Design a protein around this ligand. Structure first.
Ligand code: MNH
Ligand code: MNH
Ligand code: MNH
Ligand code: MNH
Ligand SMILES: [Cl-]
Ligand SMILES: [Cl-]
Lengths: 99, 99
C-alpha cells in the first residue's frame, strides 16, 4: 500500500478555519476504489504544518481519485485557500502493525 | 487520538538493514496500553526520511510507552545505529475517515 501526506502550511490563527473546511469533506473520497482512509492531523509539536494523511491500496488508486472525483468535488466551492503552501509527501508502506 | 511520527534520517543503502530491524520490532510496542498501531513508511518522493507513524489513545499512553518499554527493549541489543538523526512530529487527530 501507499501513503500520500499533503503537508499544508496554514497562517497563524487559521487552523480553525482550515479544519472547518475539512470537517464535511468525507463524501469526496470515502467511496473511492482502493482508498483505505485518511486523517486530518493538527500539529502540536515538532511540525507547524497540518498533515493530511491518506492511505491507498496502490499509487494507481490515488492518481485515479486525484485526477477525477477530487477535481469534480470542487464544483460548488470557491477556490480561495486559507493554506499558504503545500507539499505532497509520498511513501510506500513497508510494515503495518495494529494495536 | 494522537499521532507521533518519528522522522528518521537514514543513509542510502541502509534502508534494507533498517527495514530488517523494524521487521522484527513489533513485540516492543504491541499490546502497550492505549497503542493503536503503527506503520513504517519508506520515502518515495518529497521526503528522504523514513516516517515511523504511531497511533495512540492519548499522549499519556505514548509517554508511558516511551519512558519504560521503549527504553527497556534496548537491553541486550549490541548493534550500532544506522539512522543519522530523528525528529519527533506530534499531532492531534482532528478528523478520521475510513474506506
Ligand atoms: C491549484 C490547487 C487547488 C486549490 C487552490 C485548491 C483549493 C480548494 C479550496 C479553496 C477548497 C475549499 C472549498 C470549500 O469552501 O469548502 C478546496 C477543497 C477540497 N479540495 Mn482542493 N484539492 C486539490 C487542489 C486545489 N484545491 C488537490 C490536488 C486535491 C486532491 C487530489 C484537492 C482536494 C479537495 C477536496 C477533496 C476538497 C473538499 C471538498 C468538499 O468538501 O466538498 N479546494
Ligand atoms: C494526499 C493528497 C492531496 C493532494 C496532492 C492535495 C492537494 C491540495 C492542494 C495543492 C491544495 C491547495 C493548497 C494551497 O496552498 O492553496 C489543497 C486543498 C484543499 N484540500 Mn487537499 N485534500 C485531500 C488530499 C490532497 N490534497 C483529501 C484526502 C481531502 C479531503 C476530502 C482534501 C481537501 C482539501 C481542502 C478542504 C482544501 C482547501 C484548503 C484551504 O482552504 O486552505 N489540496
Ligand atoms: C536517543 C538514542 C537512540 C539510539 C542510539 C538508539 C538505537 C537503536 C538500535 C541500534 C536499535 C536496534 C538494533 C538491533 O540490535 O537490531 C534500536 C531499537 C529500538 N529502539 Mn532505539 N529508541 C529510541 C532511541 C535510541 N535508539 C527512542 C527515543 C525510542 C522510542 C521512544 C526507541 C525505540 C526502539 C524500539 C521499540 C526498538 C526495537 C527493539 C527490538 O526490536 O528489540 N535502537
Ligand atoms: C513515535 C515515537 C518514537 C520516538 C521519539 C523514537 C525515537 C528514536 C530515536 C531518537 C532513534 C535513534 C535515531 C538515530 O539517529 O540514531 C530511534 C531508533 C530506532 N527506533 Mn524509534 N521506534 C518507534 C518509535 C519512536 N522512536 C517504534 C514504534 C519502533 C518499533 C516498534 C521504533 C524503532 C526503532 C529502531 C528499530 C531503531 C533503530 C534504528 C536504526 O537501526 O538505526 N528511535
Ligand atoms: Cl490537503
Ligand atoms: Cl524510529
Amino acid at each position: 500500500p501507499v501513503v500520500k501526506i499533503n503537508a499544508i502550511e496554514v497562517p497563524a490563527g487559521a487552523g480553525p478555519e482550515l479544519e472547518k473546511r475539512f470537517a464535511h469533506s468525507a463524501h469526496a473520497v470515502e467511496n473511492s476504489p482502493g482508498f483505505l482512509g485518511f486523517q486530518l492531523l493538527r500539529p502540536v509539536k515538532g511540525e507547524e504544518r497540518y498533515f493530511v494523511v491518506t492511505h491507498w491500496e496502490s499509487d494507481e488508486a490515488f492518481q485515479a481519485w486525484a485526477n477525477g472525483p477530487a477535481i469534480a468535488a470542487h464544483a460548488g466551492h470557491r477556490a480561495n485557500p486559507v493554506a499558504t503552501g503545500a507539499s505532497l509527501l509520498e511513501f510506500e508502506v513497508v510494515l503495518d502493525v495494529g494495536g
